[PDB]
């Protein structure tokens, strides 16, 4: 109970509180689970004054509680106050993970064997997420946790949405995110109607980054982002322009100077040819032509790991997304109180 600043009262069960690396929800500590007798990871949350911090906290919890997969971080426990009135913070306990792809890419050159195995786990976890009818929407290196034995786990589902046809709102681009380098081009061109393919695009960016230790599209803003993308893929074909339904976005693209495609083998001369063929299918401008998670796993680059007899899917896909925008924070704090109930005495 002592981390730079405030009350991190994770009760008697958790002690030996060390300080870890920032996630997105706030202060994160490591600790000893005196019940399961193992070190864990603990995240402190306090989002009740903000409608959106509440939305993200509730999404993350509703989804992670219902997912169970080797390549997806789980929630081991949730610590919160006895009554909805005393509840101001929320501690989410999860498996302690040694590092993440973001840290690793800053210090290590990944052999093709590492790249192959990391990419396979990312997709195996994604296959499960998508089989549940969920879009992660914010895949990036720091959201890919790893242990010392290279076991990988996807985390941070605060921005995830159920692919609910009957409703999907505008304003995702306007959300605060630590980085937009992994966002698919349709996110900057159409106002909504995003599909599972935005997650495959993010994975393609991560694969590219594993191949050279540098982000492939590091724009400094939406306009710059799209320019980096078009600078490598080349100007969209008339056929590609057909997937952009927004009038101003389509006019914006036709006002941009023509650009040729830069061959993948020119950007990544030392990369495995099969990895590049797969990269090309993931970083396809047109969302409909982009490779699907299941076809991706079946790609030749991942042949030594593909095994559909050992790649779990959700038994029951979520069919509806939650009306959390038209809901005042008080009703969110409320729902957050109900969802965390299963962990109270």
């Amino acid at each position: 109970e002592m981390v730079r600043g405030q009350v991190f009262d994770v009760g008697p069960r958790y002690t030996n509180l060390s300080y870890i690396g920032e996630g997105a929800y706030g202060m994160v500590c490591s600790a000893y689970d005196n019940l399961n007798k193992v070190r864990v990871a603990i995240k402190k949350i306090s989002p009740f004054e903000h409608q959106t911090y509440c939305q993200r906290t509730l999404r993350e919890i509703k989804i992670l509680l219902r997912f169970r997969h080797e390549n997806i971080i789980g929630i081991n426990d949730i610590i919160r106050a006895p009554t909805i009135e005393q509840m101001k913070d929320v501690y989410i306990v999860q498996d302690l993970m040694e590092t993440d792809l973001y840290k690793l890419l800053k210090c290590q050159h990944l052999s093709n064997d590492h790249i192959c195995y990391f990419l396979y786990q990312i997709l195996r976890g994604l296959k499960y997420i998508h089989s549940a009818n969920v879009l992660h929407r914010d895949l990036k290196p720091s959201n890919l946790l790893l242990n010392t034995t290279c076991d990988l786990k996807i985390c941070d589902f605060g921005l995830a949405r159920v692919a609910d046809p009957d409703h999907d709102h505008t304003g995702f681009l306007t959300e605060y995110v630590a980085t937009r380098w992994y966002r698919a081009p349709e996110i900057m061109l159409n106002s909504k109607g995003y599909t599972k393919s935005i997650d495959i695009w993010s994975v393609g960016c991560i694969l590219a980054e594993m191949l050279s230790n540098r982000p492939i599209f590091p724009g400094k803003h939406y306009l710059d982002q799209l320019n980096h993308i078009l600078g490598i893929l080349g100007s969209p074909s008339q056929e590609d322009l057909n997937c952009i339904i927004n009038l101003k976005a389509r006019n914006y693209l036709l006002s941009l100077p023509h650009k040729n495609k830069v061959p993948w083998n020119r950007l990544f001369p030392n990369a495995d040819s099969k990895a590049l063929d797969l990269l090309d299918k993931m970083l396809t401008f047109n969302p409909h032509k982009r490779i699907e998670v299941e076809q991706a796993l079946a790609h030749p680059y991942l042949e030594q790991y593909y095994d559909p007899s050992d790649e779990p899917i959700a038994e029951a896909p979520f069919k509806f997304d939650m009306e959390l925008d038209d809901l005042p924070k008080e009703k969110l704090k409320e729902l957050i109180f109900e969802e965390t109930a299963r962990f109270q005495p």
Partner: peptide
């Protein structure tokens, strides 16, 4: 380890 399960012996190490 998922990797052993797949029959991969390559000792994949991390430096950080």
């Amino acid at each position: 380890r998922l990797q052993e399960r797949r029959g991969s012996n390559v000792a994949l190490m991390l430096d950080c």
